[PDB]
Amino acid sequence: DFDNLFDAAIARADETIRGYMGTSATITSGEQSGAVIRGVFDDPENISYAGQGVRVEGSSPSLFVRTDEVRQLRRGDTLTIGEENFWVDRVSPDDGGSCHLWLGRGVPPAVNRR
Amino acid sequence: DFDNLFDAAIARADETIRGYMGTSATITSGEQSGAVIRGVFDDPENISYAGQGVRVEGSSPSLFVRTDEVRQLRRGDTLTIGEENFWVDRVSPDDGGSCHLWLGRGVPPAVNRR
Amino acid sequence: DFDNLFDAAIARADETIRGYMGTSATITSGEQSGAVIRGVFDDPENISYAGQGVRVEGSSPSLFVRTDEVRQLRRGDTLTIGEENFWVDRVSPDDGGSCHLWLGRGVPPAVNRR
Amino acid sequence: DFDNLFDAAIARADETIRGYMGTSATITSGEQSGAVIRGVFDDPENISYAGQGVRVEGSSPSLFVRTDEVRQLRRGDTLTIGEENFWVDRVSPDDGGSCHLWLGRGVPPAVNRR
Amino acid sequence: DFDNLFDAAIARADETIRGYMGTSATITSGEQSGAVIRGVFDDPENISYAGQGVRVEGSSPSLFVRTDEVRQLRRGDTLTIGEENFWVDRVSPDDGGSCHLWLGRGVPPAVNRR
Amino acid sequence: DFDNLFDAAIARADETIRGYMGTSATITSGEQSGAVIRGVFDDPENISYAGQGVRVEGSSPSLFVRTDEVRQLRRGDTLTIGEENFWVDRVSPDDGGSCHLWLGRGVPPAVNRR
Amino acid sequence: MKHTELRAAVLDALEKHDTGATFFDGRPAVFDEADFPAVAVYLTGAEYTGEELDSDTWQAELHIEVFLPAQVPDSELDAWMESRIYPVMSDIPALSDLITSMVASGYDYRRDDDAGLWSSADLTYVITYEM
Amino acid sequence: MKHTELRAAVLDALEKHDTGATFFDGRPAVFDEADFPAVAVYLTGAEYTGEELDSDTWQAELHIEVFLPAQVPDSELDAWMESRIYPVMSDIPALSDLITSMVASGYDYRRDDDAGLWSSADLTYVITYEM
Amino acid sequence: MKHTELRAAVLDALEKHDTGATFFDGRPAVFDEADFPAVAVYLTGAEYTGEELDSDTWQAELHIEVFLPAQVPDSELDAWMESRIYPVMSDIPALSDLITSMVASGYDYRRDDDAGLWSSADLTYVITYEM
Amino acid sequence: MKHTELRAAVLDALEKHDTGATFFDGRPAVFDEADFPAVAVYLTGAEYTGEELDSDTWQAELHIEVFLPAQVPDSELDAWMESRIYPVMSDIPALSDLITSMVASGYDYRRDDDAGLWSSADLTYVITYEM
Amino acid sequence: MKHTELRAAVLDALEKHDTGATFFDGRPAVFDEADFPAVAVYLTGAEYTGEELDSDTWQAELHIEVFLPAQVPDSELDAWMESRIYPVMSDIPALSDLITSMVASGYDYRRDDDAGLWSSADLTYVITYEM
Amino acid sequence: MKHTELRAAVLDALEKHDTGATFFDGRPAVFDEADFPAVAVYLTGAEYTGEELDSDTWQAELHIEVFLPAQVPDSELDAWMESRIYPVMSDIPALSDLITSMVASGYDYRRDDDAGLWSSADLTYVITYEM
């Protein structure tokens, strides 16, 4: 499949690491509509100050999903981590077998394309 | 309970570390009101200069307790590390099995909401 | 061949690396025109913000091909890895056994020579 | 003595290193007045340029005392180290078993409280 | 040969690495004029931007020449790494057994000293 | 004498390292006048750009001698390293068993004290 | 003192209409990603333009800030800053007695770039008041 | 409110002409290398130069911005502004009725340097409007 | 010089009124989280505007500065400033003898942004004085 | 508009004499130590000075630069400017009809400091043109 | 320049008064924590303001610098300034012959914020002189 | 321009006086701890303040820099600038015939801060010439 001797290992690695790390995610909307995909979720904390004191601390979710099942995902769609609701804001290029998936929160913001 | 075969592992580790260092404390006011919470307390340093020189050396308390107890805390509520009192200022997002608690000192400053 | 007793070692290294890593690529146009060469592909992600929100994130592909086959390549030439077309923007100077190939994407922009 | 199992362990850690490292301190003036405290002394470097060339090279002494015996040291009080004398400028809060004492040199500067 | 008990090792150490790693560069012109020195040469990459896009990607050759045979090499004279032509820019002070030789390319620029 | 049990150890270490790495250093002028010491000389290289471009290459010699002799050394006086003659610009405060000695080169510039 | 009175009066004038937002007075704010779109009111400047021979007659700057999540299109910000907040405050009788005059100055936007968490729009008023 | 009407009016006139470009209106943009050359239009300033005793008569600056990839020669960009936008705003009856007066101010260039992904040219129009 | 008693003079006035704060004089300050809200007095500028053929008649800026804990809302600072300072500094008999003229300039706010241990309210005065 | 030909005409007006330099039009450049000392032509500014009540009469700035390697003495830069570029362009009838009025501004030096990869001398002109 | 004697003249006058300080002239300084409070004198500016069509009549600026340890309260800084510098230098006959007119400008304070070894008080003078 | 000739003329005027220093023309410099105390001559500015409807009448600025080791006291710099540069160029027939008017502009000092490897004194003049 790949003239690597190496990608097959890391591709196998991704299934194993997601086999042990991360949770399944239920996608809504988009073209995939309802589907279940396995990925690792982490939400590092971020905080901005803006003016004098306008601390708006939050977080930036990430998913690190396998590349094959995230094709034709686009941006306007939304996800669900169990009870929680997420919407994809940006995808990442594949590192060889997987790509980080960046999530927002709440409803996706408008469309603003025309 | 946790669909990762890893969360139970790390959460159990969280029980050990909190049990093996960082004392216990109790809450004052707030929804939890009287309740005893064990975490891990520490106080780094932080110095600001303001004008020509106004060095105002202080501290930065942190707790790192598991999230389940610290639910429905908000910010105005207070607490005490044993003999010394504090008040919650910021609650970190869930790491996966716990979160950090950032405390002030003395009385929480006003409300200034509406 | 090399008056170092070491470049011979590093030469076998690079072929081993290219053998066990990366893939073969086909160059289009240029003096080499249609030719097949094997390299190691890697595409780190990059974000640019420009104005307020103008996030235009893209990619920075690289090849790291051995020096011998990359000679007299110039820059206007294009390249294809797998099923997608690229084009070289800059060639790193030879390290002693190989050099990194910086690949654009799509059609190379004009010439603008004279 | 304390619900840690670790601080009491590290309480042993500080006393031996304070015995193994550093010297004794003969505090003068202040509410403690005549007393002898063990600690570890070190004097790193610091050069400020101010104008064009105004190199004012000096040092920033430190003591790392144990907080139990140095309570209510306050700030204006001085201290004689061996044959030479210093004056405390900052007392850091305890890390859990001890703290850092930041020393000035010569006489303490005025009071300027009122 | 020197009051080191240490340089003698580094002296032989220098000769070993130069023999095991390095090229037989030949010096042309200068007071040395025709001579040959074994040195370990490299071409790290350096790129400047200047204006909007004025990418001037180039190289910064280094040689790591032993001090004893590089005396009074001066600055103006050219240099030849085998079949390629260079010219010394500056000489580093001896680190103890050698010095980094910095090379330009092409004709050295003028004199401009009178 | 060293009431720490650690200062004696580091003094032995410093003596051994100065014996194994250091070089002789005959000083001229100063209160010690004709005096010979042993120190681990080194000289890092530094560059500066004075204007649109002016390369002023230089060096920052250091000695790191034991503290017992560099007492009453002041700043004006000079010293010789083998055949080369330098002058002490700065004397670092004692590290516990020694101190660094920063040197200039050539004739010390004037006095300009009163 | 007028700043507490002034800030109190204006926020009440805003709240009379339909809700939909938080009304953080003062300055410390602290939002978190649940109390979104919200409005902040504060003052700056407060100089001593003399301008008169009977009273200090100070002047200051009144800032109305509306905060929206991250990268929402500015269209709603235009609607919010032009329709939601501008016409309502155009005539507040309490302020007219409270102050000497009110003048509109600024209409700006500021998008968070680092981590792009928020988006703020600034409405600036210059106030001539005597205290 | 006029900005949405103003923004829509110009972009629709731009959209009315030949295609070949995305018409991201407003601010957030977010391109990726699939929706290339695209045009962005937005407003800034909008202060309160009084200048008129019967109506407020503000004025703001209108931006017309178009993005090109990296080292595309400026000749194309110079061609692009002429071939696409600049002659169109010479006569647009839509916004002419909408606003009071509008003149040109400048036309510039800039580009990314670190990772050089994008390259852009902006059109600045000073517009005078009453709201 | 006049500065020492000048700093002393205002310190007497504020300490004469009700306390509630430390009065660290001059500039070295150094608080730590024990001696909170407190005030300070110092001078800046001190130039030589001639203005007078027979006397040097220097002038300088006077700073009355009060620090409050971290993110306390400005209302406390507003109340503190316009009650505990501005009315007090209205007129002091000692100051009139010492200096020629006493003019107000303005007052602003600022605080520790990073970490955020303190908030500061600064009042700036203008004093013209003869050596 | 006329930007393409204006650069084209002047660069062609330069090429009539001896070669020995690249004549990079516009901006992208990208030199490497193989196409060395060369020249670049581009324009900036492009304002809308009125100056006239019949047509736009735009005004921009004309940039002509030359690049030399590393620390070659500026004597070459001076000689290159005073001979290779400055005289020939002083009368080029090709752009005489293409423009309205041409005026020189100044001549500057700026060279790479870190690693000294190059050295640039910039000649700058102000151009009034009826776009 | 005549700065050699000019600095010499003022330094002697200061040395004529009570000692208690190192009197570093010029620039290099270099203190170490044993030669504290000291005084430094140097010059800047020194342009060719002509204002006299018979002789060059340059004008320069004089800095009088005194440095104090760390966080000593400014009370003594003013006291040192008012007692050790301003009066004595106000009338020195030696200076009168060497220059044409001496004018005071102002004096401020700075201090080492990071680390914080030193505190600086500077006095600035403008000198008119002929050479 | 005539820059090479003018620099040569002033350089030869300096070299005629008793030597002891390197005389670097241009700007590459490169000193090392062997060509110390030395001088460099160069030109900046080079504008087209036409000012005259007969010829270009360009105006430039002349930099004469003198570099001394590290932290030599400024007395040596004063002596250097007063003896070897300022008087010697006060009347040079070569440059008198070369240019139209030459005016003294400024003279200042600056020494390296980080690693303090050098101390330079700059003497700058303004020159008007015709090319």
UniProtKB/Swiss-Prot annotation, chains A, B, C, D, E, F:
GO cellular component annotations of the record: host cell cytoplasm; virion component
Xref: Pfam families: Phage_attach (PF05354)
Keywords, alphabetical: Host cytoplasm, Late protein, Viral capsid assembly, Viral release from host cell, Virion
Name the record gives this protein: Head-tail connector protein FII
Subunit organization: May bind head-to-tail joining protein W and protein U.
Compartments (UniProt record): Virion; Host cytoplasm
Main location: virion
Functional description taken from the UniProt entry: Plays a role in virion assembly by joining the head and the tail at the last step of morphogenesis. Six FII proteins probably bind protein W that closes the DNA-filled capsid, as well as the U tail terminator protein of the pre-assembled tail.
Matches recorded under SUPFAM superfamilies: Phage tail proteins
UniProt keyword Magnesium, yes or no: no
GO aspect biological process, one term: virion assembly
Swiss-Prot record, chains G, H, I, J, K, L:
Entry keyword set: Host cytoplasm, Late protein, Viral genome ejection through host cell envelope, Viral long flexible tail ejection system, Viral penetration into host cytoplasm, Viral release from host cell, Viral tail assembly, Viral tail protein, Virion, Virus entry into host cell
Chief place where the protein resides: virion
Pfam families named in the record: Phage_tail_U
One of the record's GO cellular component terms: host cell cytoplasm
Database matches in InterPro entries: GpU-like_sf (IPR038512), Phage_lambda_GpU-like (IPR009312), Phage_tail_protein-like_sf (IPR035934)
This protein's record includes keyword Oxidoreductase: no
Gene3D superfamilies for this protein: Phage minor tail protein U (3.30.70.1700)
Cell compartment(s), UniProt: Virion; Host cytoplasm
GO biological process: symbiont genome ejection through host cell envelope, long flexible tail mechanism; viral tail assembly
Purpose: Plays an essential role in tail assembly by capping the rapidly polymerizing tail once it has reached its requisite length and serving as the interaction surface for the completion protein.
Homology family: Belongs to the lambda-like tail terminator protein family.
Assembly information from the UniProt record: Homohexamer. May bind to major tail protein V, and /or tape measure protein.
Record protein name field: Tail tube terminator protein
Protein's organism: Escherichia phage lambda (Bacteriophage lambda)
Organism taxonomic ancestry: Viruses, Duplodnaviria, Heunggongvirae, Uroviricota, Caudoviricetes
Gene name of the encoded protein: U
